[model samples]
Target: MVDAFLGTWKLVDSKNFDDYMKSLGVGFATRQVASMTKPTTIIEKNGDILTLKTHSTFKNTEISFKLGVEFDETTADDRKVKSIVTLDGGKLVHLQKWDGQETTLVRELIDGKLILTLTHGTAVCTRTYEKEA
Candidate 1:
């Protein structure tokens, strides 16, 4: 069975997201505080249509689209980039083309760890990253 990422998940914790922001070319100052904030994720899944909202004091980001479907991504907050999202297997995969680099991002839940990965162009940098303990 597929995991239930359908419901809303509060920002209980976060870690190593700074690396993610950095990879995205996010400003160092913004990344500093963003790294500490655990943005709440509110996900609504009905059939293949999915909506994910990440809320935080520093920033609030929300995305709503369908699986296997491609749509333009404009970050609600200060997130700068154009991207598309899809579902590969059980993981929610995001592909963003920025600065001529096709970056692939992923968000998934494994065991008690919420995993996130970022790949630059064709080369992937595995961070083995996890949330705050």
Candidate 2:
């Protein structure tokens, strides 16, 4: 089920991430750094518990949650948000809301690659990652 997403993934390509951050009101300098930074993500799943960790030269972030459960999260951009993640049609769907603003993230594994899609406001970004050996 979710086993396909349980592994380490290395960022290989990204598109419109800077604009995505801009939609979230990220600072210009932060967006610049984020757009150029390559991040590695480690995903773990056990039963209903899931943990996601992302590492980069600029910063690292870790999230732990249970499927279909809602929790509070502080985003890397310092936004306090209500977050929930669910498994739908073999895709991991993450939803976040803060100050009446909403963001959605979708993670899917296909052809040995991890595809990440992020949406904030009208900005949409796509990132691709390769499974690490």
Candidate 3:
């Protein structure tokens, strides 16, 4: 069902990403390096399990899980949380819960581009990625 978004994508544009990172309490040095890295995002599916991987010179991260199933995830900074991702109306909605704090990540396809919107409280970050055709 995620056929519309199973491939590699190049990071193109981003808005308010630093602010969004700040809301998550990412440290200053890490934020600077992350902000400057133009990362590549890869989405793949195997059987009932799906994986999302992000790669960059600054850092690389990945997660694998089944839809609608809540699982544990450790952030890039090594903080642990409960994460669940589900496909809703052709979009992937990811929810994270930890220590009574929460955040969200919504990934959708728009005009042949992958749009990832991240939100933490009032901080919002929207990132655009073009499919690697």
Candidate 4:
């Protein structure tokens, strides 16, 4: 039902990303490089299985899991956590918990743009990505 979001997306812009990384305890140099690189995301789905691939010149990360099931995740920033993904009203929402900290990530498609929001503690970041042709 939510298969429409299975595609490649290229990052266009980001807001408050630095502070978001800070809240995640990312090192200064890593955050600087991450902030400078433009990333691309590939989302693929096979039945209930989903794969999310994030690529950038600095680093790349891939995560595969079943929707509605919780699994351990190693984030791009090297954070270890339990993560779960769910679909709600056309939005892909992710919840991650690690070391007594919780984070929320939301992916939504609107007007041909993929809007991604990441919230960690008190910092929130919004990133926009355009669908690839």
Candidate 5:
């Protein structure tokens, strides 16, 4: 079941966390915190609806939407990227609409590795999942 991927994933390590924050255009103060702090990602999926909850000591955010349906996404106003993730090609495809631009993402699990690729910007982020009790 796809639900196998639904769980709380803590950041064990990040290679380009700063690059990600830089892309988000986080402010100096926020970047300082977002960079040094490790955040947790909680994902929930019911049918085609998917929700992502990010938790941190500084802040927490929850986003919910249905797959294949277009919606608006705003992040702290510093960055407002609307995106949709679809189960395409046996993988998760995330398309973010921002600044009259659209960024596409393809996610796949290979050998227990969670691989994420961002297009338009062509950035890549990878993760490994650990089952929690």
Candidate 6:
């Protein structure tokens, strides 16, 4: 039912995220601050309109849409892109396209942990989060 991942999650671990941001052309200080920041991700759904929100002291970002629908999203790094998210086999898949580049983010529930895997270019980052309450 795609309900295994609906909740507020706090980041517990991240691997190679700096390299992923480097590939995205994020600045030095920005990357530094980003590396130190911990964001809580909230996944919500109401009447088939779902929202994915990332809240942090550094920067906040959110997007709301129905499944398989496209939306204009401004990422935390300030990249305005076309994004579409869908559910596939109990996992949430997000695709973002901007300019001539594309990125993919997959949100999945694995062994009671919310795993967020992001791929941009040749860099791949895996971040783990635990549900709150």
TM-score of each: 0.72, 0.97, 0.96, 0.97, 0.77, 0.97
Off by over 4 Å in 3: none
Question: What is the C-alpha lDDT profile of model 3 across 62-104, one tens digit per residue?
Answer: 9999999999999776769999999998999999999998988
lDDT of 5 at 10: 69
Score candidate 2 by lDDT.
Answer: 0.92
- Give the lowest summed-lDDT range of ten residues in model 6: 1-10
Worst 10 residues of 3 by lDDT: 71-80
- Residue range 15-132, candidate 4, lDDT tens digits: 9999999999899999999999889999998888999999999999999999899999999998999999999888999999998899999999899899999999899999999989
Candidate 1 lDDT tens digits, 46-118: 6766787777788877777876667777763354566777767777788766556676768777774455566
What does candidate 2's lDDT look like per residue over 1-133, in tens digits? Answer: 7788999999999999998999999999999899888899999987779999999999888999998999899888888999999989999999999888899999988898999999998999999999998
Clash totals for all candidate models: 0, 0, 0, 0, 0, 0
Write the number of the candidate with greater TM-score, choosing between 5 and 6. 6
**Candidate 6, 1-133: lDDT as tens digits:** 6678788999999998999899999998999998988899999889889888999999998889988889999998889999999988788999999998999999889999999999999999999999999
Model 4 residue 24 lDDT score:
91
Put down candidate 5 lDDT per residue, 14-46, tens digits, no spaces. 556455556655567887787666667688888
Candidate 1 residue spans exceeding 4 A from truth: 1-3, 11-15, 76-82, 121-133
Which scores better on lDDT, 1 or 5?
A: 5
Q: What RMSD value applies to candidate 3?
A: 0.9
Backbone-clash count (model 4) = 0
Model 5 residue pairs with clashes: none
Candidate 6 Cα outliers beyond 4 Å, as residue runs? none
Model 4, stretches more than 4 Å misplaced? none
Clashing pairs in 3: none
